[PDB]
Amino acid sequence: PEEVVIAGMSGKLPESENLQEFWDNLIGGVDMVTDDDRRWKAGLYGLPRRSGKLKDLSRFDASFFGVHPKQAHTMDPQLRLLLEVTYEAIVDGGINPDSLRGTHTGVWVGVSGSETSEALSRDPETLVGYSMVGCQRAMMANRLSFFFDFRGPSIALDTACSSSLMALQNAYQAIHSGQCPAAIVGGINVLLKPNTSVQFLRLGMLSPEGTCKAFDTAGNGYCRSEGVVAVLLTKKSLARRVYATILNAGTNTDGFKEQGVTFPSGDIQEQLIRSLYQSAGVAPESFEYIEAHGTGTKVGDPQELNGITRALCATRQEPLLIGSTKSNMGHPEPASGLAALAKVLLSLEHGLWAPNLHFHSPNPEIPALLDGRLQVVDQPLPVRGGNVGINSFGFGGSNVHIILRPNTQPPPAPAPHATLPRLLRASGRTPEAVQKLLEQGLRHSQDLAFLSMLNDIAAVPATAMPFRGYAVLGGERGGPEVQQVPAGERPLWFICSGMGTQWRGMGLSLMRLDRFRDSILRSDEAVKPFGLKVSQLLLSTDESTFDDIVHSFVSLTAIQIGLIDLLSCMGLRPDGIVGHSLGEVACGYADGCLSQEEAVLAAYWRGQCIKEAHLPPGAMAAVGLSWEECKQRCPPGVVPACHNSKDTVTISGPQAPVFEFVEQLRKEGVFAKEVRTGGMAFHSYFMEAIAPPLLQELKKVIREPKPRSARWLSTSIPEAQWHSSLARTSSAEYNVNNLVSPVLFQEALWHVPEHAVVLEIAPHALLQAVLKRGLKPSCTIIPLMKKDHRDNLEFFLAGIGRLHLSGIDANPNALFPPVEFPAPRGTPLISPLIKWDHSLAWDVPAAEDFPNAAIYNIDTSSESPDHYLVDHTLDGRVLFPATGYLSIVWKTLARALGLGVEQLPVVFEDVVLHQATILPKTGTVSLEVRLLEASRAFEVSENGNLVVSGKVYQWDDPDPRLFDHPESPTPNPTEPLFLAQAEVYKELRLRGYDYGPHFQGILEASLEGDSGRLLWKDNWVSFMDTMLQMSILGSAKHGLYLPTRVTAIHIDPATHRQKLYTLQDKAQVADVVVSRWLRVTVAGGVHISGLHTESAPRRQQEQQV
Amino acid sequence: HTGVWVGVSGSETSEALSRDPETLVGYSMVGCQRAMMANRLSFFFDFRGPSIALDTACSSSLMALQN
């Protein structure tokens, strides 16, 4: 069939957000297993404390993939992370994902768990339907097919711990047989349900130490880990980056075994190895590295390594290297194969084999390791070069083996175009993504294939990725440009300036691009028989070279044609063309009305015919007077020739009349500037004699005219007669009339639709000011070149970048020689450079949602999220805030009803704090919360002692009126002074309150203590405690009074979010009012009523003596 | 070299058996694991080929037939 290549790769692995972190850990030896308490409490049910745990599971860019917020919450974490990983993998290989939409690509996902689905279907009465369309195993690949629009098969294998490699093998077979052009093979595994770990523990597969000491005597069993990995398998004809070539891949099962289903058989593994390598036609001597399964079991390791020895070490002298990524990252059950593939491919990319951890002495039951035939990579070793093999054996019996040929592509030899600046274009969700891609490209400005791949993946629609930026590399005056992209398509227009724009040495900077030089040479061929060559003028060094009219016109038209040729390479078809009279020849080119040869010859003949005719010198000057005003102001024999804009209207005529008009304007003071054209007044009645010879010559030149497109807007003939015969098709008559009839440029500019993206196609952006004023305010001029600029190529690339920032998609790769593929080895990974919009935090099921009242562990340790409690020190000892209990009850009620706290307005009633809980300096205090939904009552207990009691229930009908601030009893009109934060907390300290920084929230408070402002952060406890502090501040009583009862508390989160108003800084604040007459403390969306505080005796610890 | 392609889209027995952390038997996984819907058949009948448990919903059986 056809070759199958690993073209891309992406994945999240333990303690590593991207493959770059995975490699940084592999080489550096950082063990990726940890003793954290993330998934569940360590030691629960006797399980090992160690496990492979991903850094996060709650980040997901829902808006990108079109998942509504309600569906995103119920979606499986594996599915979300796999969608992101798959997109990262597809763009890793330089393939724009849109180039695969609508094709026959397939999705094979190896998944062996549905914990989230079980968690979401626990409560039959409140379960939501879409939980099934996001938690089913089938959707693990069907969602990918739906979003990416792959028409190939969508299968979700299980195959009992070999799912990833089995999916890889199925994709390989599909691509080999021609059923599919490409495949997306992914592996997913997340540890959420402790009961599965307990089952594996009972089977004896796990290890008490959580270390997979593969290939070692102390091997006992593996430690479960997590991992989401995706690879892009494509046929060679469609790939850009080649990590390796799958020479052959196969699967077989152990069959029947006497010992049991779960006992591995080495004979079957040996047979699989031998069959695949023989079928591929390889020789065992070629293999250099074998990525063993390497679980680390007393039984599995001998079987597997003896199989590898009997299969590949039969007759080879030099030893065979062995490795196992499970020593580092643990064992991802279904995703194990793809993790090993990632390790192997990264090792090949960097030219080193990552060291294996936890290997000191070999297993005495493996003769190979004790001998020298089989060697383990205990320290980094350079890659000498050879084939590689990967084997993944599930405990059910399924065996998978793949043979990889590493990509050995030498770096491209230096070429002349290497020095030339190359343009880079990036698109992204957030400015950070664009800046990351730009910086990565900047660090590698000399990597042509890398820059081409980046430029390929950046052509994503602006709606999906509203941030774009360009960074011209290799230029001395270079830097990133980043700006937001407006939505909606914007028209692309062209402008071709007149005969004024000309300078000595134009086009040399652009002569280096192949397309431009080819176009200039074609123009020279068009003009060669006449007697001049455009390139001769360009390479020339005389200032007077271009002061000849014929030379000027020929060179200008040739350069404009070259610019249009460069534009057409990138795929830009103008939606409107409008040019000044020398320019229209080029405008004729833009629409296909004029052939290149015709246009160049026409320019030469215009220049000549102007040359032959001898007329009295006539100076054309543009004066700052309105077109209509110049109509009468223009002296007899002088007419307004060009209508540049409303402010400025060019006028031409005899040199003496024009000088007289200039003098008169100087007397008036109006802007009277005289241009230089060698005493020639264009678009004036003087040229009326030139036409006849020009008429004949052009009739000879343009043989069969062509229709004028609706895009072109002729400024030679007013808009009234745009349907006449004269302007129906370009010909000698049209060009002659343009050379004679006055220019109506201002008339056409009005027709440019609002939000257009204009391009000034000319050697100099002379009409930049004219376009900036005349055209509507919201249009972008985008000039291609500049006069006397040292390197016009950089300016042109910057102009293309500004096109990129306007929405129009142009590819700068077409402007340079193509990059042969596959790309050279060592081309940097692109997957790590992609970043998403992870502002939101979606739900991930907890370990207490599966079968086994609510209990909360208050750990004040540094890492614990409850660390802020260490600032609630009263009497010199840390106490749990009274409002802390309310948050616990709120969360428990929210979990009971099924809502979140932000979505659950609550009403506490008759709260009694029976005793105070002291938070120990070391350790934890466990608080239980019990509810009686029928009675609407709650009890918080601590070691069997009652702590808090009261009533809690959802607020059926919140009323925002309840939080309107009562009119203060004291007008306080003067308000001369107010207490700052420092002063309020100094007073509280003197009373005996030692609140730390976290529990300091009163930005200001009135002298009477009846009003103020409460700072808002993500924490409710701090906010409500600051309300209680405001209540206490105005009290005259001395000594620290602590709450003992509350009669009513209302929380309405919606009104709260509406009440917050940001200060001039970035801080969010809420106004507070305390009414001691009414016994209400109302601040933001909270309402405390009937607070009672009782004096607490001072601890008399009297630590000071 | 015979192979087994079994179309299964449910693991209810896995959930019921693994509800009690302090009484769950180890071999509940062998008989209730989804992949065991084909590996067990291969083990008993001594089939040395593929053993895969597809998961496409409403079409797992016919997808297995196609494979």
- How far the first Cα of chain A sits from its last, in Å, is 91
Q: How far apart are CA A202 and CA A191, in angstroms?
A: 17
Do the Cβ atoms of A343 and A214 come closer than 8 Å? no
B32 is catalytic: no
Write out the two tokens for A258: 């006497």
Q: For residues A613 and A690, is the Cβ–Cβ distance under 8 A?
A: yes
Q: Is A326 on the interface with B (CB under 8 A)?
A: no
- Burial state string for A428-456 with b = 16 or more CB within 10 A and e = fewer than 16: bbbeebbbbbbebbeebbebbbbbbbbbb
- Taking the C-alpha atoms of residue A453 and residue A467, their distance in angstroms, rounded to an integer, is 19
Q: How far apart, in whole angstroms, are the C-alpha atoms of residue A1020 and residue A1023?
A: 5
- Angstrom distance (rounded) from CA A1008 to CA A989: 18
Catalytic status, residue A581: yes
Q: Can you tell me whether residue A856 is helix, strand or coil?
A: strand
> CA nearest B19 in A: which residue?
A851
Strand partners, A930: A939
Task: Identify the active-site residue in B20, B26, B44, B58.
Answer: B58
CA distances from A935 to A905, A932, A950, A966 (A): 18, 5, 10, 33
> How far from A1099 is each of A493, A877, A921, A1102, A1103, CA to CA, in Å?
81, 9, 17, 8, 10
Helices assigned H by DSSP within A300-430: 300-312, 326-329, 336-350, 367-370
Query: Cβ–Cβ contacts within 10 Å for residue B1, how many?
Result: 9
Find the residue in A nearest to B33 (Cα).
A160
Q: Does B29 touch chain A (CB under 8 A)?
A: yes
Helix, strand, or coil here: A180? Answer: coil
Q: Return d(Cα A966, Cα A403) in angstroms, integer.
A: 78
Chain A nearest-CA residue for B24: A199
Q: Are A238 and A5 in contact (CB under 8 A)?
A: no
Give the minimum alpha-carbon distance from B6 to chain A in angstroms, rounded to a whole number. 10
- Asked whether the beta carbons of A534 and A524 are under 8 A apart, the reply is yes
Distance from CA of A114 to the nearest CA of B (A): 8
Q: By CA distance, what is A107's nearest residue in B? A: B56
Method: cryo-EM
Q: Judged by CB atoms within 8 Å, which residues 422-461 of A form the interface with B?
A: none
Q: How many inter-chain contacts (A to B, CB under 8 Å) are there? A: 134
Q: How far apart are CA A863 and CA A854, in angstroms?
A: 22
- What lies within 8 Å, CB to CB, of A301 at 6+ separation is A214, A215, A219, A294, A295, A363, A366
Beta strands in A221-286 (DSSP E): 228-235, 244-253
> Which residue in A955, A947, A935 sits closest to A885, CA to CA?
A947
Contact A337, A230 (CB under 8 A): no
DSSP A917: P
- Confirm if A1039 and A1100 have CB atoms less than 8 A apart: no
Rounded Cα gap, residues A976 and A904, in angstroms: 41
Beta-carbon separation of A255 and B57 below 8 A: no
| Active-site residue, from A161, A223, A609, A634 | A161
Q: In A354-419, which ranges are E strands?
A: 374-376, 381-382, 387-393, 398-406
DSSP 8-class letter at A1075: E
- Whether the bond between A812 and the residue before it is cis, its omega within 30 degrees of 0, is no
CA distance A113 to A136: 10
Q: Hey, what amino acid is at A262?
A: T
A614: CB partners within 8 A, 6+ apart: none
List the single residue in A114, A140, A261 with the smallest CB-CB distance to B43: A261
Resolution at which this structure was determined, Å: 3.3
Classified as helix, coil or strand, A547 is helix
**Pair type for strands A182-187 and A106-110:** parallel
* HSE-CB of A460 using CA atoms within 13 angstroms: 22
What are the Cα distances from residue A85, in Å, to A464, A741, A841, A844, A936?
Answer: 17, 63, 18, 18, 46
Percentages helix, strand, coil for chain A (3-state, rounded to 5) are 35, 20, 45
Residues in chain B within 8 Å Cβ distance of A193: 18
Query: Using an 8 Å Cβ cutoff, are A72 and A842 in contact?
Result: yes
CB contact A41 to B (< 8 Å) = no
Rounded CA gap, A809 and A570, in Å? 9
* Residues in binding site of A for an acyl-CoA: 647-648, 671, 773
